[PDB]
């Protein structure tokens, strides 16, 4: 089940998670996909329809949709892997 994710920085992604599993498994997939540096299980929180998801409760209990979005946040730090000018590897053109 391909839940759409949204961040506090207003970035958006998707997570193909098993709806047979609990909210802890959604957290596991987020840590798996984004890495422990961005979103560790122990530091991320999960929010749907204005309510925090209980990690031990199942995904079906909140009727999460694929086209709608869940919100994920991470406490204390706010740093992320920003990009840089990839053109530096050539810095010239055919023109």
């Amino acid at each position: 089940m391909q839940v759409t994710l949204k961040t506090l920085q207003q970035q958006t992604f998707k997570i193909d998670i098993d709806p047979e599993e609990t909210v802890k498994a959604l957290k596991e997939k987020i840590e798996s996909e984004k890495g422990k540096d961005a979103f560790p299980v122990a530091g991320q929180k999960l929010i749907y329809a204005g309510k925090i998801l209980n990690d031990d409760t199942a995904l079906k209990e909140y009727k999460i949709d694929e086209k709608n979005f869940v919100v994920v946040m991470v406490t204390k730090p706010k740093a992320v892997s920003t990009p840089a000018p990839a053109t530096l590897e050539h810095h010239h053109h055919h023109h």
């Binding site: 949204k6 506090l8 929010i47 749907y48 329809a49 204005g50 925090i52 709608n68 919100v71």
Partner: protein, 48 residues
């Protein structure tokens, strides 16, 4: 001061910070409002 001493509630913070001014509770309430509005609640304050 001998003036009327009242103020104008007509104004406020339009564009929220990138979390820099918000407590953990305020960062949470911002997270709530986003998913709540996605759930079609129409930007109301009613969290349930």
């Amino acid at each position: 001061g001998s003036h009327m001493t009242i103020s104008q509630q007509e104004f406020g913070r339009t564009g929220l910070p990138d979390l820099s001014s918000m407590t953990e509770e305020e960062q949470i309430a911002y997270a709530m409002q986003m998913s709540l509005q996605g759930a079609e609640f129409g930007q109301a304050e009613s969290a349930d």
